Amino acid sequence: KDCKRESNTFPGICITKPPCRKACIREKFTDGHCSKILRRCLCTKPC
Amino acid sequence: KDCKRESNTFPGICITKPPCRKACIREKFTDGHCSKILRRCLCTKPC
Amino acid sequence: KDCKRESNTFPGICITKPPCRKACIREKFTDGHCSKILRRCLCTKPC
Amino acid sequence: KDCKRESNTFPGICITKPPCRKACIREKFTDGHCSKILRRCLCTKPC
Amino acid sequence: AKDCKRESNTFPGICITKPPCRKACIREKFTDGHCSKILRRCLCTKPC
Amino acid sequence: AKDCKRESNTFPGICITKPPCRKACIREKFTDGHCSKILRRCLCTKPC
Numbered sequence: 665k666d667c668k669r670e671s672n673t674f675p676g677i678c679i680t681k682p683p684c685r686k687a688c689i690r691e692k693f694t695d696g697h698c699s700k701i702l703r704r705c706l707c708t709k710p711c
Numbered sequence: 712k713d714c715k716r717e718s719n720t721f722p723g724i725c726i727t728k729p730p731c732r733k734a735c736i737r738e739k740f741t742d743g744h745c746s747k748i749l750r751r752c753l754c755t756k757p758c
Numbered sequence: 759k760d761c762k763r764e765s766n767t768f769p770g771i772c773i774t775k776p777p778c779r780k781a782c783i784r785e786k787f788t789d790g791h792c793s794k795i796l797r798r799c800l801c802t803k804p805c
Numbered sequence: 806k807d808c809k810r811e812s813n814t815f816p817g818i819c820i821t822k823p824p825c826r827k828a829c830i831r832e833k834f835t836d837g838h839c840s841k842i843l844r845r846c847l848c849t850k851p852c
Numbered sequence: 853a854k855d856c857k858r859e860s861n862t863f864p865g866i867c868i869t870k871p872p873c874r875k876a877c878i879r880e881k882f883t884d885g886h887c888s889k890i891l892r893r894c895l896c897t898k899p900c
Numbered sequence: 901a902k903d904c905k906r907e908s909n910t911f912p913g914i915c916i917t918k919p920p921c922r923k924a925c926i927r928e929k930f931t932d933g934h935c936s937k938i939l940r941r942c943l944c945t946k947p948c
């Protein structure tokens with residue numbers, strides 16, 4: 665399974681995936697996705 | 712902030728910290744804690 | 759474009775699409791999706 | 806519960822209701838109202 | 853002589869419905885308040 | 901925070917430049933006035 669950490673750079677409410685993914689790759693993770701409930705951008709990468 | 716990944720070795724319900732921390736350090740993380748709701752053992756390490 | 763209405767039969771909170779789609783098809787709509795903040799099951803069909 | 810979808814015939818910006826309702830009734834809905842931010846004309850009808 | 857008007861100095865966030873804006877504006881000693889339809893500011897009004 | 905604003909009751913015609921509007925508004929016991937950008941109304945301003 666992957667490691668996960670909230671994005672430090674993504675601003676505002678996480679609505680769609682691509683912007684979150686882009687922030688997370690800029691933060692040297694491999695993907696990102698919006699949290700379904702709190703709408704935070706969560707980055708993921710192999711641990 | 713630290714990365715998080717659920718423990719792959721901790722059995723059953725996460726009640727207190729020490730057993731989860733011990734499992735997570737064996738998995739080469741630096742700490743572990745119980746998730747307050749689902750009672751999963753969550754390993755943490757800098758990433 | 760499609761008309762949209764909240765599901766009358768979907769119980770609980772909308773987490774993933776397929777359970778919502780299933781309920782919406784039961785109600786004679788063609789698809790369903792989760793609303794992003796309130797997590798409602800919203801059915802869609804041709805108007 | 807009413808079905809909703811954007812007017813296909815209402816031109817321009819929805820400021821007040823009557824012109825949107827009128828367009829929506831022409832489109833065989835039963836009412837219309839402006840959306841708050843985008844100022845779309847949204848038609849509604851029993852579904 | 854229409855009413856005097858200015859933006860609420862206490863209403864937070866986006867003005868969506870009228871009652872919360874009117875409530876803020878009466879606390880500021882105006883007689884009413886309403887959301888501006890385009891910018892969604894809470895605007896207070898009073899005879900003046 | 902911002903001043904109260906109200907259309908002038910005495911300013912005739914269309915608001916082109918500020919000084920004639922400011923002068924009419926001070927007569928009306930406001931502290932300033934200015935032209936609205938599109939409709940070219942003379943808008944008077946004063947603390948609420």
Ligand SMILES: CCCCCC(=O)OC[C@H](COP(=O)(O)O)OC(=O)CCCCC
Pocket residue numbers: 697698699700773774775776790791792793794
């Ligand atoms: C598919 C297009 C229309 C329906 C979309 C919808 O209902 O939102 C997706 C919902 C969840 O909502 P969001 O992830 O917040 O967009 O359910 C899923 O199946 C995604 C599952 C988890 C994805 C990781």
Ligand SMILES: CCCCCC(=O)OC[C@H](COP(=O)(O)O)OC(=O)CCCCC
Pocket residue numbers: 820821822823837838839840841868887888889
């Ligand atoms: C009934 C006679 C006409 C009154 C016109 C009016 O109410 O303004 C139009 C409103 C405009 O929206 P507001 O920002 O709420 O003023 O839209 C509606 O259709 C009502 C509900 C949705 C609000 C967008």
Ligand SMILES: CCCCCC(=O)OC[C@H](COP(=O)(O)O)OC(=O)CCCCC
Pocket residue numbers: 809839840841842843844845847868
């Ligand atoms: C009527 C309650 C909805 C919340 C406040 C409101 O009156 O209208 C907001 C509208 C939604 O109005 P509804 O169609 O009823 O959902 O949407 C927007 O903000 C802009 C466009 C996107 C969605 C239409």
Ligand SMILES: CCCCCC(=O)OC[C@H](COP(=O)(O)O)OC(=O)CCCCC
Pocket residue numbers: 854886887888889895907941
């Ligand atoms: C006639 C309906 C009841 C009261 C008036 C009203 O509709 O709301 C105040 C209006 C609405 O516009 P906003 O305040 O920007 O929302 O203010 C004006 O711009 C007109 C002032 C006059 C100069 C343009």
Ligand SMILES: CCCCCC(=O)OC[C@H](COP(=O)(O)O)OC(=O)CCCCC
Pocket residue numbers: 912913914
């Ligand atoms: C309302 C005028 C106030 C200030 C002067 C101005 O705005 O320039 C236009 C002036 C205004 O004159 P009046 O309309 O007579 O007031 O010249 C014209 O009338 C031609 C337009 C014909 C309009 C009927």
Ligand SMILES: CCCCCC(=O)OC[C@H](COP(=O)(O)O)OC(=O)CCCCC
Pocket residue numbers: 916917918919933934935936937
């Ligand atoms: C930013 C304020 C809103 C604009 C209204 C205003 O200031 O009224 C005066 C007008 C405004 O006209 P605009 O160019 O359209 O802004 O300016 C003048 O030319 C007067 C010269 C002397 C002083 C400007």
